[PDB]
Design a protein around this ligand. Structure first.
Ligand SMILES: CCCCCCCCCCCCCCCCCC(=O)OC[C@H](COP(=O)([O-])OCC(O)COP(=O)([O-])OC[C@@H](COC(=O)CCCCCCCCCCCCCCCCC)OC(=O)CCCCCCCCCCCCCCCCC)OC(=O)CCCCCCCCCCCCCCCCC
Ligand SMILES: CCCCCCCCCCCCCCCCCC(=O)OC[C@H](COP(=O)([O-])OCC[N+](C)(C)C)OC(=O)CCCCCCCCCCCCCCCCC
Ligand SMILES: CCCCCCCCCCCCCCCCCC(=O)OC[C@H](COP(=O)(O)OCCN)OC(=O)CCCCCCCCCCCCCCCCC
Ligand SMILES: CCCCCCCCCCCCCCCCCC(=O)OC[C@H](COP(=O)(O)OCCN)OC(=O)CCCCCCCCCCCCCCCCC
Ligand SMILES: CCCCCCCCCCCCCCCCCC(=O)OC[C@H](COP(=O)(O)OCCN)OC(=O)CCCCCCCCCCCCCCCCC
Ligand SMILES: CCCCCCCCCCCCCCCCCC(=O)OC[C@H](COP(=O)(O)OCCN)OC(=O)CCCCCCCCCCCCCCCCC
Ligand SMILES: CCCCCCCCCCCCCCCCCC(=O)OC[C@H](COP(=O)(O)OCCN)OC(=O)CCCCCCCCCCCCCCCCC
Ligand SMILES: CCCCCCCCCCCCCCCCCC(=O)OC[C@H](COP(=O)(O)OCCN)OC(=O)CCCCCCCCCCCCCCCCC
Ligand SMILES: CCCCCCCCCCCCCCCCCC(=O)OC[C@H](COP(=O)(O)OCCN)OC(=O)CCCCCCCCCCCCCCCCC
Ligand SMILES: CCCCCCCCCCCCCCCCCC(=O)OC[C@H](COP(=O)(O)OCCN)OC(=O)CCCCCCCCCCCCCCCCC
Ligand SMILES: CCCCCCCCCCCC(=O)OC[C@H](COP(=O)(O)OCC[N+](C)(C)C)OC(=O)CCCCCCCCCCC
Ligand SMILES: [Zn+2]
Lengths: 128, 459, 32, 174, 63, 55, 56, 99, 171, 88
């Protein structure tokens, strides 16, 4: 009685229950060899200056620069006012403002009616 | 006010007539004397404001803003002494002249009795500011940040000029004292809806209002350190100061015209405060923190209650010393690693023990730790808005939680954790840097002992 | 120093564009 | 000697007498003797010396008295030199009345602590004044906004008077 | 870090100790003023409405 | 979505984009006298026939 | 009351001496942990005189 | 190359030539003086004397004068049996209501 | 990746450790530890890939169902209470270069030796870089391993940051 | 932290002291260089248990990527002394 492990976006599939880890062919083994080749080609370039004794400063990391550039400067040129963006923008953008506007107008309209009729308690209210 | 205008002008001869290696010493020393003499403006009375002449006056709203403005100038000179060292001598002097020219316009802006003399100087603090951003930045984006900083402000200011001249044609004058006794109610008509929208739009761009704020993450980020300090500490308060005055002649239309801006500010608080949670740039994270803090200022000003006005004045002063400190702190790291990315240098508390203390104090003031004046002002605006509508306590509360998250996240991300291995050029903190932070934080905490001098004319 | 070719760009459509992107990101043309 | 005793009333003191029904020594009394000999004595001697130095050089400061001037119900429209006089007067009164409420609040707060558990019954007099002064303050200095002025206060007063003179007719015309 | 803190302590106390001593002497040997009714037919100067000696000095010299 | 895309897309970018398009129309001219003067005739006729500036 | 009031605040002030003294470099290192411990000891006694006066 | 340009200069550490540097200037003689003016004028003139000046300001916005005046009125009001505070701020005899 | 032999070796150690969590007591753990080893020896000889993979993959499912919700973790192992408890003291050694000379004179012997190591590092660098340019394939390295020193007067390539690293209990 | 500092002699003794308490190794043919597979005749599954007993002995965990690569009584001493920073 071993129920399957159902995964969610917040609970990744264990590497020991993933079928891809137990049906391995020659092509996958070759692929894993060149994943380690890049992981080893990039490592040395970091090491050839990490260990350099005449180096004082910051080792520029292009991967870091691209990450920050993608988050800030490369968003608008890749923006297309398609159907998804227009609905999401109107919903997230204009939605809350219109929602809160009527939450406060109704609350203030209700409160104004009482204060003009005397049935609102303001006995000790002299700080506003 | 001539006792402050002339000495400010005399710094320019001092810089241009000093020995080549004493430009910073002489300018810094005498700019500190002008700050010392600025305390003479605290002769305020409880009924009548200090009226020097037909042109200049000084009430309790502009007195702390004059004291703050004159006190940052020595701090801007200290902050600029590193990245300008390998610069031409004639260009170093011109840089200092722009800062001095900026101060000269600011101390006349906060003291102008006429609203058109105010406008001319209020709009004159764009040439010295724009030139600093564009000529003494570091990235290619300074030029595009100058254009955004320029055409956002002018697009709002020009209608204000038409509106002020229209008011002069009808009321008879734009002297602020006269307007108090000649003010008339603003009847509800489509014409007055657009007079209202021209008397408040120029100021809300500079606050800035959510939506009209895309120039702040650009200008405050791309500008030099001195530009960042003045931009985020004295130049965002021009809109706040003008609004506190221009709302005098916009009653009772402000009762219903304020909703779309109270709603943008209240909801703009959460959005801007949430962006900080996910910023890759340390300097940009601090820039958005000003949009979230100044949102309360707009809400407080608009709802027009004696408690809100007291809070807005305290918030503006408190935000001035805190944002400047954070930019200076973020600039200390930048001058070592030459990168604004917040995840590049970590664990700096292990290498800079004292500088990590300054980070804590700035962060604690930013998240409104009581009894700092960052909390007195923020507390007052919350009390005022609760009486305005009890539901606003929810939006204010959420902002406090998000504010604590991004303030400590900035501290933890850069100071704690394991230091970056390949960063081996973290020089011990200079006396200039330590003294620069001590000049921000010590005045901020001392004000907690005598807070009455920053609560404005409603005290 | 980082140049234009070392920075993220538009969505890659043609297979050659995919390979250029993958090489730029230090991935494999298959993983990317 | 000290603060006037009429603004801040003080109920007469009533100290129970010591009635020791135990042979053991009382720690408080022995501690009290030590405090009055190691703390109260040198403090008194130091204060007396300091007080003597004042007697040699005695100088006085006075309480500014503001001559009453015409109020905002006597200034012609757009006459600034008269409104300015009236507005400053109204501002000083606004500040003084802000302090009257504070004094009455201090009376109410002192009563609650002084009366201890029996504060609900024995602090009704102060609570009765606080309810009346606050109402008076709320009538003349409330809902005026951050840009308050003698004109706005007058406008509120007349609106209140009109409704009082209006509802009185229907209420009184039985 | 130690050197800066030493300099901060030195310069804070450079004009702080004289002020702490100066304020102590002024209070001890000059004391504050005593409230009294304004004598009839007399116009006090604007700085005589303030209690502490330093408050009066500020008013008389600068304000 | 709301700070790098849409708040940029409505006010700054669209306003800036339109000015570029307007600028091209005004300046994309062929430099021929025959066509410049032909427009002067249109303005004169439009002034008198449409706007009645001659009355 | 004179004794109750003075000894209630001295308890609070006594706990701030180690912080104040350590700020202006007016202590001896390697003895601070024992300095703070002793201050808590005397603060405890001073807090019992108001307590006994309340119990009475 | 695409042009003739200088190389990115290395940042010069100020603790190499002058290991006692305050970080102000690369000249040790002027480096100390820039430190003295900042510390003296900054800390010993503005923060110390300025705080002392602020502490002993003449009555600021007459918040202490308002107290003395209120004590008089409450005394006079209660001594002669008058309301502590009248709900009308302006005498309703110099006011001419409409209608 | 990990060979099928490696996977069983890991699943054996990990299975024992979680079993130790449940049993706690040594006598109880020992009794069920020998039984657990019994279930491995019996199938330890079969050499059919389908049967080997099927047995291992099925063993993983049983382990993930019977695992302890809160297994024992060694104090300094990842996830433990004392993990990284001393990373706030591991100041890198290059920080010593910026010490003021007035405090470098408190340790005249130590900094004297530090100069020997710093000199011993400048001399041996150019040789190390050359060695990696002659033992490296055309394109680039394909494995994460460094060669040893093949001649007297040569230290292992890329040794400074593995030798001069901070200690486990710096203070 | 008020604990004895490990020594090269001490680590070696305890490692041998443990292997001399395993009922698959001869306590009189065991030297500090006796291979666990060829000079002593044990399988890998018995090698996993040896590392566990050593890791339980010294109160820390040896990673699998390094546990399987250590097959000698000396490789367990040069490894532990390397992790615990023992030089004499
Ligand atoms: C009454 C009850 C109701 C009200 C209560 C209000 C108070 C409660 C506030 C609520 C918050 C609670 C406190 C939260 C603390 C958070 C920070 C923290 O935990 O760490 C303490 C924090 C840092 O401690 P640390 O982690 O050990 O870092 C030390 C460094 O690593 C270096 O270590 P070091 O060993 O080498 O040297 C230590 C020290 C050595 O210090 C020095 O050597 C030089 C320090 C000189 C101090 C100068 C004082 C300011 C000068 C004003 C000028 C006046 C002149 C007039 C003089 C008198 C004559 C008139 O260096 C420093 O710490 C530098 C800090 C400089 C800022 C100190 C704060 C200044 C406050 C100014 C007064 C304002 C008080 C109002 C309240 C403010 C809000 C809390 O220090 C404090 O601020 C403690 C005091 C605050 C309480
Ligand atoms: C820890 C210490 C605990 C408190 C110690 C008790 C003494 C005390 O604190 O009270 C004394 C006073 C307040 O106490 P006080 O006002 O209640 O009483 C003082 C003495 N009498 C009774 C006579 C009035 O502290 C201060 O007033 C200090 C205020 C300093 C304000 C800042 C001045 C520096 C400005 C330089 C420019 C910097 C830029 C600023 C920009 C913003 C300008 C608005
Ligand atoms: C007190 C009781 C607390 C019970 C909480 C129950 C709410 C659980 C919501 C949830 O599980 O959504 C998780 C969702 C990611 O889940 P996903 O991978 O898409 O697959 C579906 C698995 N829920 O995460 C998401 O991104 C969407 C969340 C859905 C909205 C949840 C609102 C609550
Ligand atoms: C106001 C209502 C907006 C919501 C209605 C949107 C209607 C819509 O669906 O538009 C879809 C339209 C077509 O898109 P599509 O066919 O997929 O591809 C071709 C795109 N040229 O897509 C379009 O291209 C239309 C143009 C984009 C829509 C612009 C109108 C504003 C969109 C909402 C932005 C609101 C942001 C305001 C934020 C302020 C507060 C932060
Ligand atoms: C209160 C309410 C406040 C609301 C304010 C909203 C913001 C106002 C608009 C912000 C304008 C931002 C300026 C920066 C524009 C920009 O980034 O450049 C884009 C584009 C590029 O042109 P360029 O720089 O010359 O090419 C070389 C580039 N390396 O540049 C262009 O192609 C054209 C740029 C010129 C147009 C911008 C200047 C005019 C802006 C004011 C409105 C103009 C109204 C025109 C009259 C109405 C039309 C009938
Ligand atoms: C989006 C791009 C902007 C386009 C939308 C805004 C355009 C609004 C149209 C202009 C305003 C219309 C107007 O002229 O207001 C009417 C009134 C003038 O009529 P008036 O002579 O005063 O009548 C009574 C005189 N006894 O006005 C007055 O009474 C004088 C008050 C000053 C009016 C000038 C300012 C107009 C508002 C400009 C927009 C405000 C928002 C700023 C946006 C940047 C542009
Ligand atoms: C975000 C990027 C853009 C940033 C720039 C934003 C510029 C916003 C423009 C502000 C001007 C909006 C007002 C337009 C209508 C003109 C004012 C008006 O006519 O209102 C009159 C109306 C009468 O008052 P009444 O509600 O009946 O109460 C009794 C009063 N005696 O009074 C009222 O009804 C009060 C309600 C005023 C209008 C409420 C609108 C709320 C809309 C949601 C919030 C804003 C949405 C985002 C704005 C567009 C973007
Ligand atoms: C002698 C002796 O020590 O014991 C005498 C005492 C009997 O005395 P007594 O009860 O008065 O005899 C009857 C007289 N009518 O015998 C007793 O029973 C005395 C009992 C002990 C009383 C002393 C208690 C210790 C003192 C504590 C002082 C602080 C208060 C405790 C801490 C408060 C914390 C909240
Ligand atoms: C447009 C409305 C129009 O046709 O104008 C009618 C206008 C009113 O007529 P009337 O009753 O006589 O009032 C006279 C008061 N002076 O009397 C008129 O005839 C005035 C007509 C003026 C027409 C001006 C149209 C050109 C300006 C609009 C902007 C053009 C934008 C294109 C620019 C080129 C871009 C490439
Ligand atoms: C009334 C207000 C009075 C204000 C007085 C002015 C404020 C003080 C001016 C600034 C003080 C200063 O900077 O002095 C520096 C001066 C250095 O001058 P110097 O010796 O020529 O240069 C040596 C560099 N190696 O130091 C000395 O020469 C000594
Ligand atoms: C006092 C005193 O004596 O000032 C002492 C100090 C000098 O300090 P020092 O005693 O030489 O050593 C201590 C300093 N260290 C640690 C570097 C060695 O003055 C200064 O820095 C003065 C700075 C220049 C200001 C001169 C003009 C003053 C004008 C005042 C107008 C209000
Ligand atoms: Zn630098």
């Amino acid at each position: 009685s071993f129920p399957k492990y159902e995964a969610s976006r917040l609970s990744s599939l264990p590497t020991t229950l993933d079928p891809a880890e137990y049906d391995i062919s020659s092509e996958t083994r070759k692929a894993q060899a060149e994943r380690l080749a890049i992981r080893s080609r990039l490592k040395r370039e970091y090491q050839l200056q990490y260990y350099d004794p005449s180096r004082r400063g910051v080792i520029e990391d292009p991967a870091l620069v691209r990450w920050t550039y993608a988050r800030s400067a490369n968003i608008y040129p890749n923006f297309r006012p398609n159907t998804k963006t227009s609905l999401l923008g109107a919903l997230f953008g204009i939605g809350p403002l219109v929602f809160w506007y009527y939450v406060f107008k109704t609350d203030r309209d209700r409160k104004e009616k009482l204060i003009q009729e005397g049935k609102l308690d303001r006995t000790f209210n002299i700080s506003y | 006010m001539l006792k402050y205008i002339i000495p400010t002008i005399m710094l320019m001869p001092l810089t241009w007539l000093s020995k080549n290696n004493m430009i910073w010493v002489n300018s810094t020393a005498h700019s500190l004397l002008i700050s010392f003499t600025s305390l003479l403006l605290m002769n305020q009375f409880g009924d009548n404001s200090l009226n020097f002449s037909l042109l200049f006056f000084s009430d309790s709203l502009s007195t702390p803003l004059l004291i703050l403005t004159m006190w940052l100038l020595p701090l801007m000179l200290m902050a600029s002494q590193h990245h300008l060292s390998k610069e031409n001598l004639t260009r170093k002097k011109l840089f200092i002249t722009m800062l001095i020219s900026l101060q000269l316009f600011l101390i006349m802006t906060f003291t102008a009795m006429e609203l058109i003399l105010f406008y001319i100087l209020f709009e004159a603090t764009l040439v010295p500011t724009l030139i600093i951003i564009t000529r003494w930045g570091n990235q290619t984006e300074r030029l595009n940040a100058g254009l955004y900083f320029l055409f956002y402000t002018l697009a709002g200011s020009l209608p204000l000029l038409v509106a002020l001249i229209y008011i002069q044609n009808t009321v008879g004058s734009l002297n602020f004292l006269m307007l108090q006794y000649w003010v008339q109610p603003v009847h509800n008509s489509w014409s007055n809806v657009f007079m209202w929208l021209a008397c408040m739009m120029a100021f809300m761009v500079k606050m800035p209002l959510y939506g009209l704020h895309l120039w702040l993450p650009k200008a405050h980020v791309e500008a030099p350190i001195a530009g960042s300090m003045v931009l985020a500490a004295v130049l965002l308060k021009l809109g706040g100061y003008g609004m506190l005055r221009i709302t005098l002649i916009l009653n009772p239309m402000t009762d219903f015209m304020a909703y779309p801006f109270i709603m943008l500010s209240l909801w703009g608080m959460i959005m801007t405060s949430s962006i900080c949670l996910r910023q890759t740039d340390l300097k940009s994270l601090i820039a958005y923190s000003s949009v979230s803090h100044m949102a309360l200022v707009i809400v407080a000003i608009l709802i027009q209650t004696p408690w809100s006005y007291m809070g807005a004045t305290a918030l503006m002063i408190a935000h001035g010393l805190t944002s400047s400190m954070l930019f200076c702190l973020a600039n200390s790291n930048y001058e070592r690693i030459h990168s604004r990315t917040m995840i590049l240098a970590r664990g700096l508390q292990t290498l800079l023990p004292l500088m990590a203390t300054w980070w804590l104090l700035a962060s604690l003031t930013n998240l409104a730790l009581p009894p700092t004046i960052n909390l007195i002002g923020e507390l007052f605006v919350v009390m005022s808005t609760f009486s305005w509508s009890n539901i606003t306590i929810i939006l204010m509360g959420v902002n406090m939680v998000i504010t604590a998250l991004y303030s400590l996240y900035m501290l933890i991300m850069t100071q704690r954790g394991k230091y970056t291995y390949h960063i081996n050029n973290i020089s011990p903190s200079f006396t200039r840097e330590n003294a620069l932070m001590s000049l921000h934080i010590l005045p901020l905490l001392l004000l907690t002992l005598n807070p009455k001098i920053i609560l404005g004319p409603l005290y | 120093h980082i140049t234009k070719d070392m920075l993220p760009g538009p969505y890659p459509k043609t297979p050659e564009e995919r390979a250029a992107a993958a090489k730029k990101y230090n991935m494999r043309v298959e993983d990317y | 000697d000290s603060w006037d005793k009429d603004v801040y009333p003080e109920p007469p003191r009533r100290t129970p007498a010591p009635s020791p029904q135990t042979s053991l020594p009382n720690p408080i009394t022995y501690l009290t003797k030590a405090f009055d000999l190691l703390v109260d004595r040198p403090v008194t001697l130091v204060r007396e010396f300091i007080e003597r130095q004042h007697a040699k050089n005695k100088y006085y400061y006075y309480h500014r008295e503001f001559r009453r001037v015409p109020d905002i119900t006597e200034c012609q429209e757009k006459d600034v030199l008269c409104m300015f006089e009236a507005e400053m007067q109204w501002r000083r009164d606004y500040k003084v009345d802000q302090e009257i409420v504070n004094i009455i609040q201090e009376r109410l707060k002192a009563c609650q602590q002084r009366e201890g558990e029996s504060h609900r019954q024995n602090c009704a007099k102060e609570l009765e004044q606080f309810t009346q002064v606050v109402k008076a303050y709320q009538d003349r200095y409330h809902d005026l906004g951050a840009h308050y002025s003698a004109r706005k206060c007058l406008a509120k007063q007349k609106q209140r008077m009109l409704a009082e003179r209006k509802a009185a007719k229907e209420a009184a015309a039985a | 870090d130690k050197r800066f803190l030493k300099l901060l302590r030195f310069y804070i106390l450079l004009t702080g100790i004289p002020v702490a001593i100066g304020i102590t002497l002024i209070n001890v040997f000059i004391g504050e003023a005593e409230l009294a009714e304004i004598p009839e037919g007399y116009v006090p100067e604007h700085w005589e409405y303030f209690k502490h000696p330093i408050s009066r000095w500020i008013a008389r010299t600068f304000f | 979505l709301l700070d790098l895309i849409w708040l940029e897309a409505i006010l700054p970018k669209t306003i800036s984009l339109a000015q570029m398009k307007a600028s091209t129309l005004v300046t994309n001219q062929k430099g021929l006298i025959k066509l410049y003067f032909l427009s002067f005739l249109i303005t004169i006729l439009i002034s008198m026939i449409l706007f009645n500036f001659h009355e | 009351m004179n004794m109750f009031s003075s000894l209630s605040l001295v308890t609070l002030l006594l706990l701030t001496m180690p912080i104040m003294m350590m700020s202006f470099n007016t202590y001896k290192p390697s003895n601070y942990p024992l300095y703070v411990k002793t201050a808590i000891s005397y603060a405890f006694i001073t807090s019992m005189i108001p307590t006994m006066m309340f119990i009475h | 190359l695409r042009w003739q340009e200088d190389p990115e200069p290395e940042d010069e550490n100020l603790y190499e030539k002058n290991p006692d540097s305050h970080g102000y200037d690369k000249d040790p003689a002027v480096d100390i003086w820039n430190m003295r003016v900042v510390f003296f004028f900054g800390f010993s003139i503005v923060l110390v004397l300025g705080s002392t000046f602020v502490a002993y300001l003449p009555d600021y916005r007459m918040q202490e004068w308002a107290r003395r005046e209120a004590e008089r009125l409450v005394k006079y009001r209660e001594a002669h049996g008058l309301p502590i505070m009248e709900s009308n701020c302006f005498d309703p005899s110099k006011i001419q209501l409409p209608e | 990746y990990l060979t099928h032999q490696q996977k069983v070796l890991r699943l054996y150690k990990r299975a024992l450790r979680h079993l130790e969590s449940w049993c706690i007591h040594r006598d109880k753990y020992r009794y069920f530890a020998c039984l657990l080893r019994a279930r491995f020896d019996e199938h330890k000889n079969e050499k059919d890939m389908v049967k080997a993979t099927q047995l291992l993959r099925e063993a993983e499912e049983e382990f993930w169902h019977g695992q302890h919700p809160q297994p024992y973790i060694f104090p300094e192992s990842p996830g433990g209470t004392s993990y990284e408890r001393y990373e706030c003291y591991k100041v890198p050694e290059w920080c010593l270069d910026d010490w003021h000379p007035s405090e470098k004179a408190m340790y005249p012997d130590y900094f004297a030796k530090r100069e020997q190591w710093k000199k011993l590092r400048r001399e041996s660098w150019e040789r190390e870089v050359k060695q990696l340019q002659e033992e490296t394939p055309v394109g680039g390295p394909r494995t994460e391993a460094l060669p040893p020193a093949r001649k007297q007067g040569d230290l292992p390539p890329l040794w400074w940051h593995i030798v001069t690293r901070p200690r486990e209990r710096p203070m | 932290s008020d604990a004895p500092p490990l020594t090269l002699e001490g680590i070696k003794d305890r490692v041998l002291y443990v292997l001399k308490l395993y009922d698959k190794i001869d306590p009189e043919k065991l030297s500090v260089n006796s291979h666990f597979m060829k000079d002593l005749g044990l399988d890998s599954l018995d090698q996993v248990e040896i590392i566990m007993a050593m890791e339980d002995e010294f109160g820390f965990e040896i990673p699998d990527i390094d546990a399987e690569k250590l097959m000698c009584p000396q490789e367990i001493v040069d490894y532990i002394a390397d992790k615990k920073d023992v030089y004499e």
